Design a protein around this ligand. Structure first.
Ligand SMILES: Cc1cc2nc3c(=O)[nH]c(=O)nc-3n(C[C@H](O)[C@H](OP(=O)(O)O)[C@H](O)CO)c2cc1C
Ligand SMILES: Cc1cc2nc3c(=O)[nH]c(=O)nc-3n(C[C@H](O)[C@H](OP(=O)(O)O)[C@H](O)CO)c2cc1C
Ligand SMILES: Cc1cc2nc3c(=O)[nH]c(=O)nc-3n(C[C@H](O)[C@H](O)[C@H](O)CO)c2cc1C
Ligand SMILES: Cc1cc2nc3c(=O)[nH]c(=O)nc-3n(C[C@H](O)[C@H](O)[C@H](O)CO)c2cc1C
Lengths: 447, 446
């Protein structure tokens, strides 16, 4: 079984509720420069990584109504760039690397979003993916857009409606062979260009779509959101499911449950790909790697913890008795960030939240030790790939590529290069760039 | 006086309601490939053109209630790409060229639009502009987005509110020096990062902005829309006003009116820039140029006229007797495409609409003839610049660059190369990349 590998990034200085930016070798304070992204993309493409993945957020770290000063002192949450713009710039600098961007069904307008993603897919020749999210910063983000807040599960219902409309725009509006471009004949076959009609609980659309059928039709659908309602949503729509890290027995059960959701939705159990976040700290000896990790931790101040947690949950941990069990608390925002701490207390969470944030504890050791841990995770949890989540950039990515990936390639668990030209062919193993017939999006094709 | 020059383009096969795509040398059927745009951008940047301009449209040519099949046979209105994506891809392939993209105040969300434009400005190091439109295809576009239609003058009221909000996001949310990025100090100064508050008739926003202060702060504000209400809007907000072609005395009156609008808003009269569309066919002799233009007209079927005109006005010209004068027709869409023919009749412009659409006839002649026409227009109408509107691509652009631009440079009416690194410095002559202190957007700074 050949695993897929992508790089997790985001267009801001820090990520995932941590703040490693002060580490001497970290360079992502340059995230607002194109040279930073050109460098990252060239590193990944030269190595043959399947894709670079851009996370996104729309809101900010509001604590009990205001944003504490530490958020600016540490660049915790803001400022950021728009992922679609970063992705479009990286198209021009790459030829084979996949580009996956996070996009919110809560805050995008589906008609404009459909045109934007199809434009990226046209210009990149089918290298685009979309990580479907319902936005974990939903409360502040709604305020910034001037619209009422939408509850957690309703955002997944709204996302269902969002998907049906973009499926119509991407798959039903223009048939794949509509464009003929024959100067002696027809530019397009009118019989293959259709008005679409959509009247859902959240979205309405009537008319033609702006973009013609793109190389992949629909961008590769990533999905990140491992709440119960999110797992149902990913089991229905997601082609590649991004999972946070966890002990192998817990990760195996999550993978099993998500494959069973896909089966209950009429999809083949193997037609959905499960990819785990994976962070690592690599050094020539195990003791050196442990020390390297200590230096990363030493750069992070604990004072970010409360605002960081409030950024994703709206919960102010500093206002409860630290013995309060997390099982008693609820959020309409990032529900996995509460549910993952069931059994623990508020004081437990607040004790080392700053160290990992929403992220996973790293695997720390020699290159062989880290490669062994990747294989153990993939076999033990039935995973299809990994998104490398760096602790500092570009060092964490360079270290993995230079020292761990070659062992994985020699063991035959990582491919040596770019076999297929589109992201879907590469990730899903199809020999067609378009959605499988047992995917919901296929049902909206002109038949 | 040094004139500025940009290239008008759009991310679709044809433009402006005409359809020249069948000409053997036309390449814009490749608009959905990045290589097409790389070539255009390289041609413009090698020549030192100030910018490439991307128009936009959201709607389509609805005649009565649907799209005649001639729209697909001729690729008249669809398909197209998103201009921001094209612009971002061209950022990476260029270093000094300006990139101006059309964006709709009717259908964009200001908060996400502000983040998008500022991201383009950061990544391009201050080379981005925004052409503010209220969408001339508003009826179909509104149905596509599932939103109720907004009447013509109300769309400019909505644009006013849109502008105030994005000014707050671009100028007032993060002070220009907020970021320090000092690993032994602070990442940012909390006293220079501000919560903004906005409550308007059309938009609302409360909270922080996503993007820090970008190199120009606000993209260079182009504005296109020459109705009376649009001239008032441009006079307040626009830094570079895009005007359609017209006879010199009519263009001159428009320039005069728009500068008076700017003065009324507390701006200096010279500080708003007026740039006219200009199309031309160039050849070594006049007779060669006439024949070269005729070979273009030969590829344009008149059958698109009804759909093309309906695309911009919602009006079906074949549904009137030709004797009906245009002065009796009215639209809530592209009102200038109705007002420009006041005094003619339906049958008059139905007969020639396919030739030029929303544009005007090209100047056809030798390089010396075309350069003379450029100078006579700029002097007579008090213009600051031109946007070349090609007839075919890349041929019309190359011809202008290789044969007319050298004359203009030798005469001293065009600069020889790139003088300044940001688009606002190059077009407005400011001392720094940010808005003039007498522009309304500067009032929203902290
Ligand atoms: C690995 C990974 C990455 C994620 N990245 C993002 C992101 O970049 N932006 C986002 O809004 N939501 C992301 N999420 C989703 C949140 O956890 C959350 O889902 P859920 O846990 O509530 O189902 C939604 O934002 C809630 O609206 C991610 C989830 C996972 C598992
Ligand atoms: C030279 C040039 C170019 C224009 N380009 C566009 C465009 O690309 N997209 C657009 O929606 N509206 C463009 N317009 C504006 C339309 O004429 C029209 O303005 P107005 O004439 O009614 O004031 C608005 O679309 C109405 O909503 C342009 C106007 C001019 C003068
Ligand atoms: C393992 C992992 C888990 C994540 N969980 C969340 C989450 O629960 N909510 C959220 O908004 N973002 C989540 N993210 C996205 C992350 O916080 C990202 O840096 C921000 O969204 C800024 O782009 C997660 C990212 C990773 C790598
Ligand atoms: C001189 C000139 C005038 C234009 N007038 C309009 C207009 O009135 N309405 C409109 O929607 N677009 C107008 N455009 C934009 C043009 O139709 C563009 O090709 C389409 O919007 C597709 O991007 C104009 C463009 C030029 C160069």
């Amino acid at each position: 079984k050949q695993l897929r590998f992508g790089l997790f990034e985001n267009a801001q200085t820090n990520d995932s509720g941590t703040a490693t930016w002060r580490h001497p070798d970290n360079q992502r304070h340059l995230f607002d420069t194109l040279d930073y992204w050109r460098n990252i993309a060239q590193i990944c493409e030269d190595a043959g990584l399947d894709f670079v993945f851009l996370a996104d957020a729309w809101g900010w770290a509001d604590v009990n109504g205001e944003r504490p000063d530490i958020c600016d002192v540490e660049g915790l949450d803001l400022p950021r760039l728009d992922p679609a713009i970063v992705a479009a710039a990286l198209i021009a600098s790459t030829t084979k690397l996949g580009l996956v961007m996070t996009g919110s069904t809560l805050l995008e307008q589906p008609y404009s979003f459909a045109r934007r993603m199809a434009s990226l897919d046209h210009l990149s020749k089918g290298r685009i993916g979309w990580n479907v999210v319902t936005t974990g910063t939903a409360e502040t983000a709604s305020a910034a857009f001037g619209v009422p807040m939408v509850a957690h599960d309703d955002r997944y219902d709204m996302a269902d409606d969002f998907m049906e409309l973009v499926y119509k725009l991407w798959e039903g509006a223009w048939e794949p062979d509509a464009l003929e471009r024959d100067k002696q004949g027809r530019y397009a076959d009118p019989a293959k260009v259709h008005r679409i009609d959509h009247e859902g609980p959240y979205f309405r659309s009537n008319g033609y779509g702006n973009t013609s059928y793109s190389p992949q039709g629909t961008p590769v659908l990533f999905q990140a959101g491992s709440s119960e309602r999110g797992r149902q949503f990913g089991g229905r729509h997601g082609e590649c499911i991004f999972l946070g890290g966890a002990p192998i027995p817990k990760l195996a059960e999550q993978v099993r449950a998500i494959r069973a959701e896909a089966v209950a939705e009429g999809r083949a159990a193997d037609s959905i790909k499960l990819m785990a976040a994976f962070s690592c700290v690599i050094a020539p000896t195990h003791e050196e790697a442990v020390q390297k990790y200590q230096e990363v931790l030493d750069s992070q101040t604990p004072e970010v913890a409360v605002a960081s947690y409030a950024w994703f949950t709206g919960l102010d941990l500093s206002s409860y008795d630290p013995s309060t069990p997390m099982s008693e608390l609820h959020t309409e925002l990032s529900q996995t960030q509460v549910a993952r701490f069931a059994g623990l207390t508020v004081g437990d969470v607040l004790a080392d939240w700053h160290a990992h944030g929403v992220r996973t504890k790293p695997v720390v050791g020699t290159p062989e030790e880290v490669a062994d841990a990747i294989v153990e995770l993939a076999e033990g949890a039935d995973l299809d790939g990994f998104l490398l989540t760096p602790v500092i950039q570009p060092g964490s990515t360079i270290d993995f590529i230079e020292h761990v990936l070659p062992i994985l390639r020699e063991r035959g668990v990582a491919a040596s290069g770019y076999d297929a030209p589109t992201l879907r062919e590469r990730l899903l193993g199809t020999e067609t760039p378009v959605l499988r017939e047992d995917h919901p999006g296929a049902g909206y094709r002109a038949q």
